[PDB]
Amino acid sequence: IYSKVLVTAIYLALFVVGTVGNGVTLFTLARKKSLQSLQSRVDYYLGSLALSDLLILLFALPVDLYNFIWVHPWAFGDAGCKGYYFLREACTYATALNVVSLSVELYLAICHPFKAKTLMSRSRTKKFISAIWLASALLAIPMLFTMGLQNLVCTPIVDTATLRVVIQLNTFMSFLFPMLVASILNTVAARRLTVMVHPGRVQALRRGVLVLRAVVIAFVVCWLPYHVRRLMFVYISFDFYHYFYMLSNALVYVSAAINPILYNLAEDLVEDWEKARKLLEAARKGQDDEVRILLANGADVNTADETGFTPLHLAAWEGHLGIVEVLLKNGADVNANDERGHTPLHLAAYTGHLEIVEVLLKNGAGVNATDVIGTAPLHLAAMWGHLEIVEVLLKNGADVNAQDKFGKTPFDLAIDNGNEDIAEVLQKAATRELEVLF
Ligand SMILES: COc1cccc(OC)c1-c1cc(C(=O)N[C@]2(C(=O)O)[C@@H]3C[C@H]4C[C@H](C[C@@H]2C4)C3)nn1-c1ccc(C(=O)N(C)CCCN(C)C)cc1C(C)C
Numbered sequence: 001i002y003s004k005v006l007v008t009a010i011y012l013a014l015f016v017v018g019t020v021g022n023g024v025t026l027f028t029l030a031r032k033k034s035l036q037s038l039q040s041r042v043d044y045y046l047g048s049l050a051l052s053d054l055l056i057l058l059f060a061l062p063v064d065l066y067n068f069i070w071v072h073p074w075a076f077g078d079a080g081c082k083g084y085y086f087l088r089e090a091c092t093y094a095t096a097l098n099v100v101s102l103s104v105e106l107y108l109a110i111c112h113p114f115k116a117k118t119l120m121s122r123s124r125t126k127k128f129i130s131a132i133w134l135a136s137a138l139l140a141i142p143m144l145f146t147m148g149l150q151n152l153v154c155t156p157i158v159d160t161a162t163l164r165v166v167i168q169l170n171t172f173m174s175f176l177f178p179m180l181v182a183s184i185l186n187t188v189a190a191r192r193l194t195v196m197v198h199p200g201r202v203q204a205l206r207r208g209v210l211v212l213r214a215v216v217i218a219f220v221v222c223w224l225p226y227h228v229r230r231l232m233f234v235y236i237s238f239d240f241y242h243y244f245y246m247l248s249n250a251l252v253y254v255s256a257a258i259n260p261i262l263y264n265l266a267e268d269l270v271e272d273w274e275k276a277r278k279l280l281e282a283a284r285k286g287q288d289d290e291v292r293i294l295l296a297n298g299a300d301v302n303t304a305d306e307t308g309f310t311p312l313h314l315a316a317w318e319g320h321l322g323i324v325e326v327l328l329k330n331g332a333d334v335n336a337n338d339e340r341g342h343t344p345l346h347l348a349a350y351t352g353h354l355e356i357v358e359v360l361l362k363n364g365a366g367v368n369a370t371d372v373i374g375t376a377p378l379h380l381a382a383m384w385g386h387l388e389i390v391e392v393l394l395k396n397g398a399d400v401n402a403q404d405k406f407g408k409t410p411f412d413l414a415i416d417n418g419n420e421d422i423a424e425v426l427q428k429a430a431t432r433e434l435e436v437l438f
Helices: 002-031 037-070 077-111 113-117 122-139 160-197 200-234 240-285 288-297 311-318 321-329 344-351 354-362 377-384 387-395 410-416 420-437
Strands: 147-150 153-156
Touching: 002 037, 002 240, 037 077, 037 122, 037 200, 037 240, 077 113, 077 122, 077 147, 077 153, 077 160, 077 200, 160 200, 200 240, 240 288, 240 311, 288 321, 311 321, 311 344, 321 354, 344 354, 344 377, 354 387, 377 387, 377 410, 377 420, 387 420, 410 420
Parallel strands: none
Antiparallel strands: 147 153
């Protein structure tokens, strides 16, 4: 009683946010104008898959929601009968060829960049996608002859042999072949790209491969069970099949409806990650030009790596004052900690960059700040033997006696590594503390 009503609520809900979701996606990518060519041609293939997803929701779902679900006689006529399975057939090819075409174009860009330069174009892609949608429609024409009305049911109008033949050809070159081709190229290209990686066009590639990875997986998730259902008709000849048929078909509508919401959601999340990742690399590498541009875009000043290394940790460690300066200018945290519990002041004192040590303190770095090891900036300056830094550290209220978990003072470490000059400074500095205390 409430079962049929339960599906209605879901199937109608999928139609609303699905039609709109894909609709919004089609208008979004239309107005979109990326400077990198690959970014555009990728989004033309995404826009092509959004149409395929939209057509399925507008034409097929209503026929399913009523005849297939709600009201178990055929009420759409032979024109609508042949049309339902035509459009549904046409969308599988359209989706399949796009998934392949995208992977081919994307593969070429990575593995044959110079060959691709002479071949690929926004113009040719935009045209070629029209040719896809034609071929998709032509390959779907057979299903017009393969279906008809009978006694009132839109049942097949050809032999089981000819029916088992078309589903075989359908499932082969509208799922099996494309998945196979996409999976091979998306693996060969990915391997090449991580090797090439180990800028604008290279950024578009990293995005493009990330997209195609998400596309193919999403494509395989929903269409596999659908094509598995089709495979049954070809080969197999108790009541689980009926349950599998309904779930496999329903999954297509769910995917088509949520994918635009997901893609839009995943984009923003990965965009946040990619911008943040870019800054960490840029700060460590010393490419100040990027860092300045990345900050304006809206990258998090207090991003952290797997270790817990923020831009200020990397910039101070590598010794890029220009970056350390602009990082603090864009509200970077001077007292930020990593895994071990090192502050930028630890790493600036470690490397020995005097100017950076001064700036960190001037912007309010913790001078006695201790890590889990028990070590402090003064220990690291004495350790490496930076006689200039120990001076400016001692100036800014540094605890000379402060010992670590190894029971060693900076004066001990200074004496240990036999930096005679630096060791004499701490002795005199320590004496002053006794007079100050007394
Ligand atoms: C041999 O076929 C199967 C074997 C095992 C599982 C299957 O699908 C889950 C199937 C199965 C596949 C299809 C199928 O592809 N149906 C079509 C399709 O939807 O793609 C339909 C009907 C024909 C014209 C077009 C194109 C296809 C063939 C629309 N229907 N169908 C199917 C589904 C349910 C029932 C059904 O209601 N049953 C009586 C289930 C009985 C199960 N006991 C045998 C245990 C019957 C079939 C066909 C055999 C006609």
